[PDB]
Amino acid sequence: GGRDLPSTGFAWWSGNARLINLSGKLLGAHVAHAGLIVFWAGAMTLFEVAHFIPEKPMYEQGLILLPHIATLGWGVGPAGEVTDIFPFFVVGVLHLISSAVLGLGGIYHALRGPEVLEEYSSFFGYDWKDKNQMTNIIGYHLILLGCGALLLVFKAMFFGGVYDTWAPGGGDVRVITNPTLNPAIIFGYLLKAPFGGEGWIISVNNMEDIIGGHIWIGLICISGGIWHILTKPFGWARRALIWSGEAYLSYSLGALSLMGFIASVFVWFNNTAYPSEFYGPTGMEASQSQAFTFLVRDQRLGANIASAQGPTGLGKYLMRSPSGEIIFGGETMRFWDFRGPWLEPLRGPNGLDLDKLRNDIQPWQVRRAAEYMTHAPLGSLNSVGGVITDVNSFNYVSPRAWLATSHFVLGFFFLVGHLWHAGRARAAAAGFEKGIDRETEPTLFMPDLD
Amino acid sequence: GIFRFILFLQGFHNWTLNPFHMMGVAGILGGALLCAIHGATVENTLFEDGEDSNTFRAFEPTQAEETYSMVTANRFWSQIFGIAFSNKRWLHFFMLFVPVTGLWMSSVGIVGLALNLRAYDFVSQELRAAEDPEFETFYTKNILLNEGMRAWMAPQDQPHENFIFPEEVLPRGNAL
Amino acid sequence: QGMFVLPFMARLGVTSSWNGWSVTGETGLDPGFWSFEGVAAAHIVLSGLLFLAAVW
Amino acid sequence: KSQLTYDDIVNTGLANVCPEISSFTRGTIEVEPNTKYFVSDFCMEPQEYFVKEEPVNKRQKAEYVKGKVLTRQTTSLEQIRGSIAVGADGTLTFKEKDGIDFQPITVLLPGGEEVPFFFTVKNFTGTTEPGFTSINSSTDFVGDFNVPSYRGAGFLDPKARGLYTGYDNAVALPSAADKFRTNKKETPLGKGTLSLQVTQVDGSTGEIAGIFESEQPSDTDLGAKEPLDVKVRGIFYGRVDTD
Amino acid sequence: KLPEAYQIFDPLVDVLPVIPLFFLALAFVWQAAVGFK
Amino acid sequence: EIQRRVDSQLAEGASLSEAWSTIPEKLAFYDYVGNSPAKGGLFRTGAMNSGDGIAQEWIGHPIFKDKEGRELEVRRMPNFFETFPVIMTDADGVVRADIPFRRSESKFSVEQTGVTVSFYGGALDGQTFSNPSDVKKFARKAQLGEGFDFDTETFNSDGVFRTSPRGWF
Amino acid sequence: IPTTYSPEKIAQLQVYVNPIAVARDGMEKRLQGLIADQNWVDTQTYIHGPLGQLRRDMLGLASSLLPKDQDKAKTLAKEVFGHLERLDAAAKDRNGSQAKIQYQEALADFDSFLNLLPQ
Amino acid sequence: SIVFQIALAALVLFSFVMVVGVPVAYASPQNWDRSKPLLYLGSGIWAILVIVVALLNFLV
Amino acid sequence: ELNAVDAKLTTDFGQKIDLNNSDIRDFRGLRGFYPNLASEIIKNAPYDTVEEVLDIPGLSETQKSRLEANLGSFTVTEPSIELTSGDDRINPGVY
Ligand code: CLA
Ligand code: CLA
Ligand code: CLA
Ligand code: CLA
Ligand code: CLA
Ligand code: CLA
Ligand SMILES: CC1=C(/C=C/C(C)=C/C=C/C(C)=C/C=C/C=C(C)/C=C/C=C(C)/C=C/C2=C(C)CCCC2(C)C)C(C)(C)CCC1
Ligand SMILES: [Ca+2]
Ligand SMILES: [Ca+2]
């Protein structure tokens, strides 16, 4: 294929578009880029390990990868205390070396390997219009994805377990012996409203549900992989979809935008797959923690926190949710759907329980609430912690803030890319992506509007 | 420094409430809108004048013919938005007119503020709130915000005045 | 109170509001949609539809 | 709320419902002549709200009007602790001690007036007639309770006027600042009357349920206007510790 | 931090993660060498 | 200028009341912030009498004393401020009294510091006020400069200042 | 590797021995009756509340113990936690019999764990 | 213990020489006769160095 | 017209620590008071005279001595519910 504008029709700034029909070069680009991803995983892990002070919390040190490893149950014990630093190092080293291998392969295919693969092999050669081959590649990758989900399941069940922040006796790494395979729970998660108090799938709150849903995901992905290997797209799919490389790219871009938004919300709200031990409190958690901290302090001072009415007439410390549940008062009324391992022991069937509040509060809960209140996910861009009017002496931005902001931004720009490529794929399939033909300008053959 | 000037004008002059500033905002946002929409409309109604996917080199500065279809653009915007430009000359004069008039109107408002001739208050709502302690609007809330800004900002912003506002005279809500 | 059209609604049986009051001096009555407000809104919508038919 | 969990209870409105005892219940709770018994989890669930409208004519019957609650299922007192003492003659004295013993409630009346009031049972001491050697279906605790100001003295009105905080004048009108009567905020301690008709006693477990009717003033908005008369009818439940 | 045996390459791991930014820049270097064909 | 005239009167041997009574009401009226052209609003229309009202008479010059005899000066409202906190300073520029916004940690209020005001010249000549409500009212007046009795009924004046013909021109 | 109790090492154990003894006392007193009263909400609240540091404290007993007793104490604490988890499971499903079984299991393993306690 | 340090420094040096040489060798079709065996040898030696580093990790 | 709190600031309440109306932060100046003795005092209000603060039931000998030592700082005024309702003596919304 050509490597300039005259021979390709694409400028340098759209040079990767020149690869659309060079399957070998495209494969090289993909493999090298995968090498970039794995390289970042390894290098960032080693950086985080090197810059890790293991007696300080992870979320106080700007770490986003080490929490992922800790959640999987590696190198941590009860309450998230880092037992062994070596497994983090091993994850990083393995990713770095494998990235070397992937980069070598991507360079080979991009620079010297065969330009196209179709006259080399039918198995690896593909045509974008070859619907059966495209569904074959879908099938292979679906099988792989289901296998990866089952790898998560195997780690949680047979290889030491995963970190369970809801464990009795304290959050700890525990082995999940009874995943919920019950499809009612698993698929009723997908039907929950994406609004406050329901939290469509962000509300999954126990590792049994997570592991069981991953068993279901693995089975679904593998069976769909086989289904796509053994069939071709049906008539309705053929009549509804654009069948081109750019169209498939646009479809994947839409999917990725959806996943990016979901991940940003997930890290912002969920404290089960993102234990606060490693990611710090959620904003909801920190607000509730402040309310709890001052309930505890004022109660020790002698305030009768059940009957103390605030300035507006609502309870200063306790109040009712619009459905009647007893909740913390103040602005944190909006966060009454929050559930956390440190707060549920004080919750009764009706909400917060006066008897537990008056005699069941443990010193570790007070310490945890103070920590979470002071590590609220508020911070400046230059990493000054606290409310924006605070002064420069607290260097902290929550990992939840970093992850949520970054992935909302990436989700948005991938929605933009999906719009761009979907529109372009449609126009190119219909053949007017290069502009209006003067001879057959469609609007010239149309009746005037009025 | 400019940010300080901006917040100063909000707190002391209630500059957002000023109709001349609102016409300025309308002009600037409309100018940005016109820029974006015109650029996109032209780029997406281009004539097929070359063979490259790169449409940028299918234009020649000395060419006599339009490079994009005004008719198609007009039909598109008539059906999408209800109305559309049909005169190119009026379109470009409008692109000049909108932001320039916005700037001129905002300048008139600033001239007013030079003499403290502000659009600070709505007297009817002030009187009602003074006699009715349950009347609350976003306007009155903004008035409260301005009071807070002035009291907390003046001692540092105007050091030559030697403003000494003891902690107890500072307005503030509960718990904050 | 200088009420001109209200008596004409009340004459034919529309005597209650959405605010719970009724011109018979009663309160808490439920008129349904055919309150004073409902009748007025129906007339406004009718006016719009008639305008459109006139244009056509 | 029966005997569920919070997962079963959340977002249902059951959290705002006082428990009920049973149907086949006509027991009585024996009491000693001069000992006092703790009340464990006292609940009051209002169901009807009436505001005494004020005629402009004069001298004419005011006729309580039925209101509707604009605030949601946030209207119930619960987890209240108290005590019942048996007088020398046989009097039964119910004394509220603490708990979630207040809820702000806003009711809408026909005409568009919204009436916030501080529904409460605070410091309620109520008594029966003498000669009660038992708590039964005839036990009527009629008494008084305190009604604090709806808005506390830390509240600020839309012009940042308040009692122990805020301005004391209309600052937006510099030449007429001290002219407005609402420049002075007030928090009078209003008074209420309550009756607690016990209708159902399960002496085995000590739970008592019944009906209540309460009379109390509404919000004055820190003395901005005269309080209306609000009447609340509802039901109640509590456990009486026999031992 | 890094296990003790590895802390002589601590100032190397400090700069490793930023390399893919250099790859993105290198794309432009390569296109500039070929005259942005 | 007013202070200079009063000081000359005193330097002869006039008492406070006589010296301040030598001040013409016209000069005192010039010394009043409601007559500054930088106090109006773009849509506060009409005559300045439509604002504070028609001025009737000068109330005389207030002199604020706290419980300890310190003479206090009320800080005047600048042209910039639509509203301004009430602050009283003594001779060496130390805040000695104010009107607190929050009272639970109040230290310098008119109530705690025992500030009293006596008037010289004008309508209130020779009278002294110790009720903190009156003292606070007169301190708020003193923020605006010389105090004046106003007829607010004739124009149904609204209470917010207007600009002068100087400002409108 | 002293492999012998001494006056000063006992004081360093004591800082964790106190909360664990309090937890065992509570497990004998309150949690048993909570299970007996068929009170699942309070069973779960107790095991997640006052017990919400039991793992940390008993791994403090184990990790800071004798070279013979370190691994044994660790394993015993782990078995206690497993019984605690199965207790939580039997409470969430209102399994009174299984919960009583697990409570006896946790008590027996806790007593075995405190058995290898000097003094 | 110094042997591990030496091996890891050698591995970093060989990673640098591979990172330089590999793209040049893959993008010089004229000198592919003598750079393909050099690529094979270099990949083998790089893998050997990685294996040695891994073993000396547990040996040190 | 002063509302009611400013009228209290006219009294001895605005000059020293009122045992019936002062917030618990107001006791921090007295060494050894906040928070325990201060909370005990606020719990056992009202007091008709300053002297009955020494008659707090269950008081302690060191607390007795501290109260006697700081008797001078104390006053007793009528307990105004403006300052008292809602547990504002414990938390008046000031941090
Ligand atoms: C997997 C995702 C994906 C893939 C494979 C492609 C692939 C392609 N895109 Mg595309 N795109 C995407 C996502 C993707 N896109 C998203 C998310 C957007 C929204 C922004 C777009 C918007 C877009 C446009 C407008 C165009 C393409 C085009 C193309 C084609 C050529 C592009 C090229 O040569 O690169 C060249 C690379 C550059 C010129 C460098 C760009 C650098 C960016 C702008 C900034 C990088 C910021 C990054 C975060 C790092 C910050 C650095 C900081 C430290 C300073 C190509 C097939 C072109 C096309 O349509 O072909 C027919 C084209 O016109 N895309
Ligand atoms: C992930 C990023 C990425 C990847 C994988 C690719 C990949 C590719 N691009 Mg491309 N491109 C990119 C970003 C990327 N691009 C950006 C951001 C721009 C805008 C500036 C472009 C603009 C562009 C244009 C205009 C063209 C391409 C083309 C190509 C293809 C041919 C490569 C070539 O011959 O050049 C040769 C370059 C060299 C020989 C220099 C050395 C390159 C090597 C790989 C450097 C590796 C260094 C590494 C550290 C060494 C480690 C080795 C090992 C030990 C691990 C190829 C598959 C061409 C094409 O489409 O072919 C038909 C083409 O004409 N691109
Ligand atoms: C998805 C990634 C991918 C894909 C689709 C391909 C595809 C292809 N490669 Mg390539 N390659 C890759 C990555 C990839 N490669 C990487 C990372 C490297 C660096 C090591 C290479 C280095 C390479 C060289 C040097 C050559 C190719 C060649 C080829 C072509 C012939 C394949 C063949 O029949 O040989 C046989 C395939 C097998 C015997 C199957 C072995 C499968 C692997 C090696 C075992 C591991 C399987 C693993 C468990 C599955 C999951 C992987 C795991 C990481 C998750 C073919 C189109 C050849 C070519 O182009 O012909 C002229 C060629 O000479 N590749
Ligand atoms: C990445 C994975 C992947 C990809 C790319 C595909 C791609 C495809 N599949 Mg599929 N499939 C998969 C995984 C995948 N599959 C798995 C894991 C299974 C096993 C369950 C299946 C089982 C399956 C079947 C039975 C069929 C396909 C078919 C198809 C083809 C057309 C279907 C279509 O238009 O999609 C889009 C879907 C629609 C247009 C229907 C509308 C669905 C609703 C109305 C949209 C609402 C979504 C909502 C907004 C999102 C909320 C999330 C949640 C709450 C629901 C297409 C090429 C069809 C085919 O042609 O087979 C050869 C077909 O019959 N697949
Ligand atoms: C279904 C349609 C409908 C309905 C249910 C109503 C209902 C109502 N209208 Mg309304 N209106 C309508 C359509 C409708 N309107 C239309 C299309 C117009 C525009 C012309 C109006 C304009 C209108 C006005 C201006 C007013 C109303 C008013 C009212 C309210 C009282 C009406 C009244 O007093 O009757 C009076 C009707 C008559 C007395 C009819 C007289 C017809 C004469 C006597 C017959 C003519 C001779 C005959 C044909 C020959 C002999 C035949 C015989 C032998 C059979 C009432 C709620 C009043 C109101 O309350 O305001 C909110 C009001 O003032 N309407
Ligand atoms: C520069 C000339 C000038 C000046 C300085 C004044 C000044 C004054 N006049 Mg006056 N007057 C004038 C000309 C002037 N007048 C003219 C030409 C007439 C004949 C109509 C009058 C008739 C008049 C009357 C009847 C009265 C006055 C009064 C007054 C006094 C009150 C001022 C006031 O509130 O106005 C208010 C000013 C505003 C509210 C500003 C209005 C700004 C408008 C809305 C701008 C329009 C925006 C525009 C549409 C934007 C264009 C859009 C863009 C696309 C181009 C004041 C001293 C009053 C008085 O007190 O008399 C004793 C009074 O009763 N005047
Ligand atoms: C002056 C005078 C007179 C006269 C009067 C008249 C004649 C008038 C009138 C009047 C009128 C005659 C009025 C009216 C009106 C109206 C209205 C007010 C309307 C409306 C409407 C609407 C709003 C609609 C809308 C719509 C549309 C448009 C379409 C679609 C549908 C809708 C609904 C949306 C007389 C003689 C008596 C005498 C005295 C004086
Ligand atoms: Ca380093
Ligand atoms: Ca205080």
Q: Structural domain boundaries of chain H?
A: 1-60
CA distance G39 to chain D (A): 10
User: Which residue in D28, D78, D53 sits closest to D234, CA to CA?
Assistant: D78
Specified resolution (Å):
2.0
Q: CB distance I85–D186 less than 8 Å?
A: no
Q: What is the number of residues in chain A?
A: 450
Inter-residue long-range contacts of A297-300, CB under 8 Å, 24+ positions, other chains counted = A298/I87, A298/I90, A298/I91, A299/A357, A299/A358, A300/I35, A300/I39
- What is the Cα–Cα distance from D186 to B133, expressed in whole angstroms? 13
- What is the Cα–Cα distance from A424 to B162, expressed in whole angstroms? 64
Q: Where does residue A441 rank: exposed (0-12), middle (13-18), buried (19+ CB within 10 A)?
A: middle
DSSP string, A193-247: -SSTTT-TTTT--SHHHHHHHHHHHHHHHHHHHHHHHS----HHHHHHS--SHHH
CA distance I13 to chain D (A): 13
User: Which residue in A38, E2, A65 sits closest to H57, CA to CA?
Assistant: E2
The SS3 assignment for D83 reads: strand
How many other CB atoms sit within 10 Å of the CB of residue D147?
24
DSSP string, F32-75: BGGGSGGG-BTT--S-GGGTT-EEEEE--EEEEE-TT--EEEEP
**Tokens linked to I54:** 């020494």
- Whether the CB-CB separation of D19 and D208 falls below 8 Å is answered with no
- What is the Cα–Cα distance from D83 to A252, expressed in whole angstroms? 68
Cβ-Cβ contacts under 8 Å for G15 (sequence gap 6 or more): none
Radius of gyration of chain C, Cα coordinates, nearest whole angstrom: 14
User: Which residue in B53, D121, B86, I17 sits closest to A15, CA to CA?
Assistant: B53
- What is the Cα–Cα distance from A359 to A305, expressed in whole angstroms? 13
Work out whether strand D114-120 and strand D102-108 pair parallel, antiparallel, or are unpaired.
antiparallel
Q: CB distance B121–D172 less than 8 Å?
A: yes
Which residue has a Cα nearest atom 8 of ligand 5? C9
One-letter amino acid at A348 equals G
Q: Cα dihedral angle (C25, C26, C27, C31), rounded to 10 degrees?
A: -110
Taking each helix axis from N to C terminus, what angle separates A283-301 and A363-374, rounded to the nearest 10 degrees? Answer: 130
- What is the Cα–Cα distance from A316 to I87, expressed in whole angstroms? 9
How many other CB atoms sit within 10 Å of the CB of residue B64?
5
Q: CB distance B52–A14 less than 8 Å?
A: no
User: Which residue in G15, G22, G73 sits closest to G52, CA to CA?
Assistant: G22
- Residue F37 dihedral angles phi and psi, to the nearest 5°: -75, -5
Cβ-Cβ contacts under 8 Å for F162 (sequence gap 6 or more): F39, F40, F41, F44, F45, F46, F47, F48, F50, F51
- What is the Cα–Cα distance from F129 to F134, expressed in whole angstroms? 6
Work out whether strand D36-52 and strand D77-86 pair parallel, antiparallel, or are unpaired.
antiparallel
**Tokens linked to C29:** 């009555």
DSSP F109: B
Q: Determine if ligand 3 sits within 6 Å of the CB of residue A27.
A: yes
Sign of the CA dihedral running D149, D150, D153, D159: negative
- Whether the CB-CB separation of D46 and D234 falls below 8 Å is answered with yes
- Whether the CB-CB separation of D163 and I93 falls below 8 Å is answered with no
Sign of the CA dihedral running C21, C24, C25, C27: negative
Which ligand has an atom closest to residue B112 CA?
A: 6
Q: CB distance B165–F100 less than 8 Å?
A: no
Chains contacting G with at least 3 CB pairs below 8 Å? A, D
Place of tokens 């032209």: B42
Inter-residue long-range contacts of G107-116, CB under 8 Å, 24+ positions, other chains counted = G107/G27, G107/G28, G109/G76, G109/G79, G109/G80, G109/G83, G110/G24, G110/G27, G110/G80, G112/G76, G113/G58, G113/G61, G113/G73, G113/G76, G113/G77, G113/G80, G114/G20, G114/G21, G114/G24, G116/G65, G116/G69, G116/G72, G116/G73, G116/G76
Question: Would an 8 Å CB–CB cutoff place I60 in contact with chain F?
Answer: no
- Does residue F18 fall inside a structural domain? yes
Nearest CA in chain A to G41: A348
One-letter amino acid at F9 equals Q
- What is the Cα–Cα distance from F100 to F95, expressed in whole angstroms? 12
- Whether the CB-CB separation of A69 and A84 falls below 8 Å is answered with no
Q: CB distance B168–F107 less than 8 Å?
A: yes
Cα–chain center distance at D227:
16
User: Looking at beta carbons, which residues of chain I come within 8 Å of A293?
Assistant: none
Cβ-Cβ contacts under 8 Å for A293 (sequence gap 6 or more): A366, A369, A370, A373
Domain count, chain F: 1
- Does residue F132 fall inside a structural domain? yes
One-letter amino acid at C50 equals L
Question: Would an 8 Å CB–CB cutoff place F82 in contact with chain B?
Answer: yes
Question: Would an 8 Å CB–CB cutoff place F102 in contact with chain D?
Answer: yes
User: Do B and E share at least 3 CB pairs under 8 Å?
Assistant: no
Cβ-Cβ contacts under 8 Å for A297 (sequence gap 6 or more): none
How many other CB atoms sit within 10 Å of the CB of residue D110?
20
- Whether the CB-CB separation of A211 and A185 falls below 8 Å is answered with no
One-letter amino acid at D115 equals V
Domain that holds residue G104: 1-119
Work out whether strand I17-18 and strand I74-75 pair parallel, antiparallel, or are unpaired.
parallel
Q: Where does residue B63 rank: exposed (0-12), middle (13-18), buried (19+ CB within 10 A)?
A: exposed
- What is the Cα–Cα distance from F110 to F116, expressed in whole angstroms? 8
- What is the Cα–Cα distance from F47 to B108, expressed in whole angstroms? 23
Cβ-Cβ contacts under 8 Å for B94 (sequence gap 6 or more): B34, B85
Inter-residue long-range contacts of B107-115, CB under 8 Å, 24+ positions, other chains counted = B107/B24, B108/B20, B109/B15, B109/B18, B109/B19, B109/B20, B109/B21, B109/B23, B109/B24, B110/B20, B112/B18, B112/B20, B112/F42, B113/B9, B113/B13, B113/B15, B113/B18, B115/F37, B115/F38, B115/F163, B115/F167
Q: Which helix (H) or strand (E) holds C9?
A: helix C6-11
User: Which residue in D165, A44, A125 sits closest to F103, CA to CA?
Assistant: D165
- Whether the CB-CB separation of A46 and E2 falls below 8 Å is answered with yes
- Residue A419 dihedral angles phi and psi, to the nearest 5°: -60, -45
- Whether the CB-CB separation of A176 and A156 falls below 8 Å is answered with yes
Of the candidates A197, A351, A354, the beta carbon closest to that of D15 is on A351
- What is the Cα–Cα distance from F36 to F51, expressed in whole angstroms? 13
- Whether the CB-CB separation of A163 and A172 falls below 8 Å is answered with yes
- What is the Cα–Cα distance from F57 to F38, expressed in whole angstroms? 23
- What is the Cα–Cα distance from A54 to B58, expressed in whole angstroms? 61
Question: What's the distance, Cα to Cα, between the start and end of chain E in Å?
Answer: 47
- Whether the CB-CB separation of A72 and A275 falls below 8 Å is answered with no
Work out whether strand F61-65 and strand I17-18 pair parallel, antiparallel, or are unpaired.
unpaired
Gaps after residue numbers in chain E (C–N over 2.5 angstroms): none
Question: Would an 8 Å CB–CB cutoff place A97 in contact with chain H?
Answer: yes
Q: Cα dihedral angle (A43, A48, A49, A55), rounded to 10 degrees?
A: -170
A331 is in an annotated binding site: yes
Name D190's bridge partners: D147
Q: Where are the domains of chain I?
A: 1-85
Ligand 7 neighbours, Cβ below 6 Å, are C 44-45, 47-49, 51-52
Q: Where does residue G18 rank: exposed (0-12), middle (13-18), buried (19+ CB within 10 A)?
A: exposed
**Tokens linked to G70:** 């370190």
How many other CB atoms sit within 10 Å of the CB of residue D131?
10
Report the nearest atom of ligand 4 relative to the CA of A146.
Answer: 17
- What is the Cα–Cα distance from D177 to F160, expressed in whole angstroms? 10
b/e sequence A160-189, b meaning 16+ C-beta within 10 Å: ebbbbbbbbbbbbbbbbeebbeeeeebeeb
The SS3 assignment for D204 reads: coil
The SS3 assignment for D25 reads: coil
**Tokens linked to F111:** 């109530």
User: Which residue in A188, A214, A211 sits closest to A201, CA to CA?
Assistant: A188
Which ligand has an atom closest to residue C11 CA?
A: 5
Which residues between 51 and 90 in chain I have a beta carbon less than 8 angstroms from any beta carbon of chain D? 81-83, 85-86, 88
- Does residue F4 fall inside a structural domain? yes
- What is the Cα–Cα distance from I83 to B22, expressed in whole angstroms? 46
One-letter amino acid at D11 equals N
- Does residue F167 fall inside a structural domain? no
One-letter amino acid at H47 equals A
Q: CB distance A449–B79 less than 8 Å?
A: yes
Nearest CA in chain I to B168: I94
Give the up-direction half-sphere exposure of residue A58: CA atoms within 13 A in the CB hemisphere.
Answer: 30
Give the up-direction half-sphere exposure of residue B141: CA atoms within 13 A in the CB hemisphere.
Answer: 4
- What is the Cα–Cα distance from F90 to F67, expressed in whole angstroms? 13
b/e sequence A344-361, b meaning 16+ C-beta within 10 Å: bbbbbbbbbbbebbeebb
